[PDB]
């Protein structure tokens, strides 16, 4: 039961994502690797023309992925706009990904995996875990988004649908959906080029009551590397 209005920016609990940043201002160094720990989220600032590599180190982990325009969290990578622009349910290498203004925000340059991702499913939240029978607080992607932005002094005005990297949620004839383990492999990566200055947020999904992060249900970390704009 709810006794207050919904607050997009307010976390329902805490983990180290509230206080720990990857680097000052989210500005990752060239030639460095960084890690989003298991069950946590982090924000990353990109300049136009830079490219971000996201690496599924252990091979079965989902990365809930968002991007916001620098200086405006009201404009963001938008799944419901991405789909009509591409005339496709999920992106492939070469696809330009748009914001809620239908302008380019990112390009998916590379994907070493079989290409299975999800754009249909909301980020997990305390309500999802309560409905799955969990008692007490559970780490969750929506809180990780809120905290990761907060750690850079930013405030979302809405929770967009994530791009669920490596998530395998097939829709079959009839419209039904299934929660299945991923088909990615150890070390698979995706590479995104920024088409605008952006703030990217990645949450290492902590879902451990369904097999979506692997049959073992043991959430793991993700590694990232930021490439500078080409010479």
Q: Which residues are annotated as a binding site for Zn(2+)?
A: 64, 124, 141, 205
How far is residue 20 CA from its own chain's centroid?
17
Between 32 and 130, CB nearer to its own copies: 130
Spell out the residues 6+ positions from residue 198 whose beta carbon is closer than 8 angstroms to its own: 45, 46, 67, 68, 69, 70, 105, 106
Question: Own/partner pairs for 80-86, CB < 8 Å, 24+ apart?
Answer: 80/161, 82/119, 83/119
Nearer to its own copies, 95 or 223 (CB): 95
Give the β-pairing of 96-98 and 104-111: antiparallel
Question: Which residues are documented as binding site?
Answer: 64, 124, 141, 205
- Residue with Cβ nearer its own copies (32 or 132): 132
Task: Tell me the C-alpha distance between 113 and 97, whole Å.
Answer: 19
**Nearest distance, CB of residue 127 and Zn ion, angstroms:** 12
| 50/118 with CB nearer Zn ion | 118
> Applying CB under 8 A, which residues contact its own copies?
2, 5-8, 69, 71-72, 74-75, 78-81, 83-84, 87-90, 100-103, 120-122, 125, 127-128, 131, 157-159, 161, 171, 175-179
Q: Give the count of beta carbons closer than 10 Å to the beta carbon of residue 225.
A: 18
In angstroms, what is the minimal distance from the CB of 169 to its own copies?
8
Task: State the binding partner of 90 from its own copies, Zn ion, Cl ion, none, CB within 5 to 8 A by kind.
Answer: its own copies
98 touches Cl ion (CB under 5 A)? no
Non-local (6+) Cβ contacts of 196 within 8 A are: 48, 69, 70, 99, 103, 104, 105
Pick from 43, 77, 98, 141: which binds Zn ion (CB under 5 A)? 141
Residues that bind Zn ion in the complex, under the rule CB under 5 A: 124, 141, 205
């Amino acid at each position: 039961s709810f006794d207050r209005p919904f607050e997009a920016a307010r976390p329902d609990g805490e983990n180290p994502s509230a206080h720990e940043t990857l680097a000052e201002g989210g500005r990752l160094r060239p030639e460095a690797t960084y890690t989003i720990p298991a069950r946590q989220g982090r924000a990353i600032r990109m300049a136009q023309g830079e490219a971000l590599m996201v690496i599924n180190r252990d091979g079965s982990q989902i990365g809930d992925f968002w991007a916001f325009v620098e200086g405006d969290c009201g404009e963001y990578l938008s799944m419901e706009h991405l789909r009509p622009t591409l005339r496709r349910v999920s992106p492939r290498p070469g696809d330009v990904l748009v914001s809620n203004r239908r302008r380019p925000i990112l390009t998916l340059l590379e994907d070493s995996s079989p290409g299975v991702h999800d754009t249909l499913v909301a980020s997990c939240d305390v309500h999802r875990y309560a409905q799955l029978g969990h008692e007490g607080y559970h780490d969750n992607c929506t809180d990780n988004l809120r905290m990761a932005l907060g750690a850079l002094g930013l405030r979302p005005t809405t929770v967009p649908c994530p791009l669920n990297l490596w998530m395998n949620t097939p829709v079959v004839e009839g419209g039904a959906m299934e929660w299945r383990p991923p088909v990615s492999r150890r070390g698979d990566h995706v590479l995104f080029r920024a088409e605008l200055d952006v703030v990217v947020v990645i949450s290492c999904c902590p879902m451990d009551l369904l097999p979506i992060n692997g049959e073992e249900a043991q959430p793991r970390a993700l590694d990232v590397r930021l490439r500078p704009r080409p010479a």
